[PDB]
Structure 1
């Protein structure tokens, strides 16, 4: 079973899954301390519920909210929006690119215990348990980011929950992360190398897939061209790695961690929001001759295999 913000669900209930999404990209405590930044908490909820309902009408049944503590994850917001929209949401532990001092002063052992707390006991006082570990790194893995990756590997090994990563400021970087994960004994089948659609180096992606890594082609609408990114899905299929592909939008319904009103810029480029993958990418792949069964394998079978805790 897979833990969601409304409790455990069985694999058969997961359905069509977007594996790299957010409700809100923010900072810890910020939605509670300045909800007016987003108009109001009520306005953010209404926008997220409409957006998730739109995705649900296009076939989505589950999203993975990869927001960590330091990206302002508010699991009570996620639970409210999940219930209102009837879309499952998997919550995350881990560390993104803006850890406060109380996180970035910590050792690998301490970070391991924090991730384990959020997976095994629950997030804050809610009883909601994380179902994924998210780690972000920058170009050249910093000493702290290496501790995070090792703590994530150790928490995954103790719980079976998967790890999803990405590299900021670089079109590659999966090899750095893979070497650290493998040094810890982590299986590549527990790891998605995310934002992999930001490179055109197909031999780099094929080599990671051949080692058993999942390839996150999950920023498709952020080409602000999306068709070129989406053709990477067909190319990995043609190489025989359909089972290794995860697809998503990397979307959100509010954002405070960048410039003011960046949400408006994003919405203007991708008015489909979370429905961009099912409404645009899936029909595009079908028009290119990808069979429905292969598309269902990528959007349903692969995410369930990835998310199912597997020791």
Structure 2
């Protein structure tokens, strides 16, 4: 098929090495436009993001998935500018993160479905840029509104073929909650990535999800500020026979306003490699532990392309 990016559709063969869970900027809807000086300037943030993406591209990355939603301050014009200047494909996201404003959290499941469909089928804002993934975040115990969001995401995925990525905040597991809801809606597990899965060491829980067909997002590796321990989960799942169900990423960004001021400086001090951490540190580490090149290319190239390719029949 073809995959929608912020610069238009691309073919599966163009996707290449893909980081499945990233952001350019973690913010709030409208905030970058209303207070760019919070980031120094818009120009300073663009320059930082372009340098960071060029560095990742020189380490082999060809595509990132920016999973920022409306309520995380997704600015698709920023994504398009950085994508062109860095020559890295960026897939944009619809969905709902953990800070929905009243105009979102007052909505019914049917209205949320129509919102997701608008961003996937017509475009984001007035840009014509279409989302290629649906991002949902939940908390420990799924709230009633978070359940609406998951069901709307399943309905939008079933209508368009685009995949869903999800994570549970403040709890190790929680994938079982989401899996139950997604399956009640008829969604195929092969369209769902259970993200932040490197945050738990319960390997039997991850193996059980993989066996049901879910993709396992090991996508917070550099956030253990031990990263080697998290990366060994990749090896463990390969050894259980589930190399085809693994997605790897950094969950990095280049500006952040939704937490404490200057939290970006904290993150940059613990991981100065940025989104190059996966290609420069994790892949060599796994190679040294005996994972073949062919398996590594399956995880970083084959698996993301299969996931992102719109598939209504899976």
TM-score (norm 1): 1.00
Give the total of aligned pairs.
Answer: 311
Deviation string 1:30-53 (CA, Å, 9 cap, x unpaired) is 000000000000000000000000
**What SS does the aligned partner of 2:158 have?**
helix
Residue in 1 that maps onto 2:303? 302
CA-CA distance at 1:108 after TM superposition? 0.1
How far is 1:21 from its partner? Answer: 0.1
Q: Which runs of 5+ in 2 are unaligned?
A: none
* 1: CA distance, partners of 2:262 / 2:231: 27
What corresponds to 2:267 in structure 1?
A: 266
Q: Residue deviations 1:66-105, cap 9 Å, x none? A: 0000000000000000000000000000000000000000
Residue 304 of structure 1 and its aligned partner are, at CA, apart by 0.1
- SS for the counterpart of 1:271 is coil
- Per-residue CA deviation, residues 52-74 of structure 1 (Å, 9 max, x unaligned), is 00000000000000000000000
**Using the alignment, how far apart are the partners of 1:76 and 1:114 within structure 2?**
19
Equivalent residue runs for 1:1-311 within 5 Å: 1-311=2-312
TM-score for the superposition, normalised by structure 2? 0.99
Over residues 143-196 of structure 1, what are the superposed CA-to-partner deviations in whole Å (9 max), with x where a residue is unaligned? Answer: 000000000000000000000000000000000000000000000000000000
1:12 CA displacement: 0.1
How far did residue 112 of structure 1 move?
Answer: 0.1
Unaligned runs of 5+ in 1: none
> Which whole-Å deviations, capped at 9, do the CAs of 1:222-247 have from their partners, x for residues lacking one?
00000000000000000000000000
SS at match of 2:79: helix
CA distance in 2: counterparts of 1:236 and 1:158, whole angstroms: 31
Q: C-alpha distance in 1, partners of 2:225/2:109? A: 37
Residues 244-284 of structure 1 deviation map (CA, whole Å, 9 limit, x = unaligned): 00000000000000000000000000000000000000000
User: Secondary structure at the residue paired with 1:149?
Assistant: helix
- The 2-side partners of 1:226 and 1:261 are apart by 23
Off by >2 Å, runs of 4+ in structure 1? none
Q: Give the alignment's Cα RMSD to 1 decimal.
A: 0.1
Q: Distance in 1 between matches of 2:205 and 2:260?
A: 33
Paired with 2:208 and 2:64, the residues of 1 have a C-alpha distance of 27
Give the C-alpha shift of residue 212 in structure 1.
Answer: 0.1
Distance apart, 1:134 and its partner CA: 0.1
Give how far 1:136 is off.
0.1
Q: What is the CA–CA distance in structure 1 between the aligned matches of 2:174 and 2:45, rounded to whole Å?
A: 34
